[PDB]
Ligand binder design. Sequence first.
Ligand SMILES: CC#Cc1cncc(-c2cc(Cl)c([C@]3(C)CS(=O)(=O)N(C)C(=N)N3)s2)c1
Length: 388
Amino acid sequence: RGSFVEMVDNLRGKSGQGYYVEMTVGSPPQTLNILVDTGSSNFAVGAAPHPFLHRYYQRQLSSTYRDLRKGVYVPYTQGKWEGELGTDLVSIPHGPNVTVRANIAAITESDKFFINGSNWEGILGLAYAEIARPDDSLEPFFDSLVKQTHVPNLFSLQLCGAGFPLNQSEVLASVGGSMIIGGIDHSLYTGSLWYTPIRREWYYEVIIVRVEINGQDLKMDCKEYNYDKSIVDSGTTNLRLPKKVFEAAVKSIKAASSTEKFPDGFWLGEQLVCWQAGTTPWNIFPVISLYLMGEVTNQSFRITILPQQYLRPVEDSQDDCYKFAISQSSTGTVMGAVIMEGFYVVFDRARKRIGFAVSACHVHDEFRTAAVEGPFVTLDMEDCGYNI
Ligand SMILES: CC#Cc1cncc(-c2cc(Cl)c([C@]3(C)CS(=O)(=O)N(C)C(=N)N3)s2)c1
């Protein structure tokens, strides 16, 4: 049974541009579309005109706006923003029926942060205070929400990839998924939920203990899989792997799909590959299984994704085109949107654990499905975690 009907189907977007939820800030309420990001901890919104924004937060029009008289500069390689800190009343129209006083970073200047055509005007950082900017004294939105209300300390995400490209109008009209605040909606998944511990509360950090490509063990020291960390990040498009893991995984994926040769640019995630309408050879591409530390001692479980997850649909023609959505990282494993699209993901902050179940909206074919299975007997799993 599905017990959170008001929050089901409250997301829009896609893996390449991000998934967002509608929010309101200020008095009277100012509506904004907000990127759902489990990989950061700031609630930051556009608050000045920008060519790629059609709306922004107007603090002078909010009677409940409180100025914190403090600036914040947050530079990332993926985009940078400068903001002015303050507080205001915040609601999630298709969320719990509560109004919170929360910190807001009013973005006044930015460099390649807002993306042309994304439809979002801000970011909802759902990770922990440890990685909030300027420091951990700036309470993240979800912490304020739990402290001020009776909403349980848990949220769950069902990110829904369409399995095909969505044009400018389609992406605005389509349901991109669900963010259930304070609970688990049982209609969003099939089978059982399996839980992996949150290693440390900063990013949503996890431990990967084994990797298979079509059941074939990648056979690397498991520390390599979590070098220097492994995180679950709705604000990353790809499955990102540490350099050495990426090189071994791409070699194995190429060997499994060897009946068809792809250009170097395809494996670099830069070039698209196209096939005649309806003829994508899904079967030649292998499944990928990530084994995660279980809640019970010496116990693991696996999550299995299909090429329908790691081949991201892109428009070219009537051909079906894709980009390879597995890429190299120098900052550890990132289980991005293309992985999350296969699963219903429960961020159980109260019990310091992350749940995975097969998503009711994952893209598959008649021959294979994504899977969440266990238990498996796995020894010295603590040794898989990286230190320093
Ligand atoms: C699925 C999707 C998506 C998507 C699309 N367009 C923009 C973004 C982001 C830009 C920035 Cl900046 C982000 C930060 C705050 C820093 S980051 O290091 O780039 N990062 C990986 C993260 N999780 N948070 S997300 C995400």
